[model samples]
Target chain A: KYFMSSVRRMPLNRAKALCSELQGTVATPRNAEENRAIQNVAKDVAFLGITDQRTENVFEDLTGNRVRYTNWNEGEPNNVGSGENCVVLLTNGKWNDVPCSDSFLVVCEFS
Target chain B: KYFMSSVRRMPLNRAKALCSELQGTVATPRNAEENRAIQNVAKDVAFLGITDQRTENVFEDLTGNRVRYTNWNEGEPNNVGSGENCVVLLTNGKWNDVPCSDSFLVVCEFS
Candidate 1:
């Protein structure tokens, strides 16, 4: 299940914290279908529950599990300066890891 | 889990059948969050899984249960011609019982 607070977007850390408060985590796409589902909710770039902050080039979801499905946008996860650790979803079904400070919509996922 | 067929809209019968062929059924919101999720997928009017075709004034989901939650739009389910048996979801968190023949985007829900 998912819901997006469309009126406001926040930085990755703030979005994830808000998601936790909502009894969910930031949206994480398990597969292409699920990714499409998430995209439906996120019309613009949105912070996803994925990051390589702990270990560069080793992206994992908030649950600390490695993402099994990767739909990186052209030349993504480049690690550019290693500051681009947080992943954001592109509306065209692509992903790009940018700095956590970047603002994006908050989409939460519940079990 | 749900997805909307945004490219082409179809009549109620074809839409539901298409959903079945995709190994799912016409989308049905289980609760507020789920309904919001559905809203995200359905930016336009879309056919939902509730209808009163068999009996006028009696509404049941595709699952054959009386919907526990109803969010009908203003002045709806009037059964004006006694032919408004199918339900269509408005993007703004509202529902309406319209004629089944009207074409609408098909949103499917999976188990």
Candidate 2:
């Protein structure tokens, strides 16, 4: 299940740590249903657990599993400005690449 | 804009012909906005205007212009079964490659 961490906004890394502290994870959606759930729970834009830090255009979750279901916004994951190694969910239920330092709302997915 | 021909399914070549007869060409979504519009209007998986028939992995629209935008689902464009040179758009807004001989819905984009 997923829970909204609407208490505050956190950047990608900080949000990761926050979820870890909560014994959950930064939400990662594998399909349209999961994506819409995350989007609905989010107060605004939010971070996902996937990143392309090790290689460009190859996204993996924090646990290093390749992302199977991708919902990138058109022209998104563009890696704009070179540091868009982190993934974020737009309220429209699609993903975009962004810098890790940018803060946003959080969603924690627990097993 | 895009118009759908859902009355009957046709193979890639036949669908192309249908569009041409209507004074339009097969739909080719240039970017995400167009892609979403096509997806929103599509009833089922439909043929797009692009094909890699001339050269594998070098997608071009019917006009022979290189496609500027792509949203292939993960591990796609495999050219599976050897004849998968034509493109199709799923209702989910991503694309796939299928054989031109396979019949499906049609969307035509007009200038």
Candidate 3:
């Protein structure tokens, strides 16, 4: 897991490209330990890989990993307007859905 | 570690309020793997705890943890115009300095 702290912002697609360039995927926290690890480095809102572009309400990681675990906020993953398909890490360590094009921070993950 | 996904957008202060209510603080990723876990769930930009509010060029997390690990993008934490202080994750898996009042997503950490 790596949270690049730079003055650069991009879309989800661009973030994915960077991850791939680093020889890794966006990120997929499969367990509690993994989630905790991320919190250790990231101290801000950033990007990951969980997306439902192919289908609403169904999220997957960059490498197409099934989302067996999730840490959504209360009444979250609402898929509001059916347009919010991408996920983001809240400072409180929760997950929220937003527009894929919305610019924000990025964090790459390597297996 | 938890990444909340809600329709609400809040500034750094409001996000911190929510984190305190949840018995956690803004996330503070300390390593590469930790950063990756955050990306697993966060696919958009969000809020975090690292800031240089007390001093310039010096960043710290909510828990007063020293920023020993950072994934800064090229020419990041610039403190552009000496205004940017708070941090946020970019869609490209990188971090950036922004205004504290800037509203965005939130992610909380319990441990």
Candidate 3, A1-111: lDDT as tens digits: 433321356788887765554345666667777766665556667776799888778898765666998998787888787489899877777888889988876666643
What's the C-alpha lDDT at position A69 in model 3?
Answer: 89
Q: Tell me how many residue pairs clash in candidate 3.
A: 62
lDDT of each: 0.78, 0.80, 0.71
Best by TM-score: 1
Clashing pairs in 2: none
What shift in Å separates residue A60 of candidate 3 from its native position after superposition? 29
State which candidate has the highest lDDT.
Answer: 2
- Which digits, one per residue and each the tens of the lDDT, describe model 3 over residues B11-43? 889878655643457777778776776666555
DockQ of candidate 1 compared with the true complex: 0.02
Q: Report DockQ per prediction, comma-separated.
A: 0.02, 0.01, 0.02
Candidate 1 deviant stretches above 4 angstroms: A3-5, B1-111
Candidate 1, residues B29-104, lDDT tens digits: the string is 7788877888887768888899987678788888688877778889987876747899988878798888899898
The order by descending lDDT is 2, 1, 3
Each candidate's fnat, listed in order, reads 0.00, 0.00, 0.00
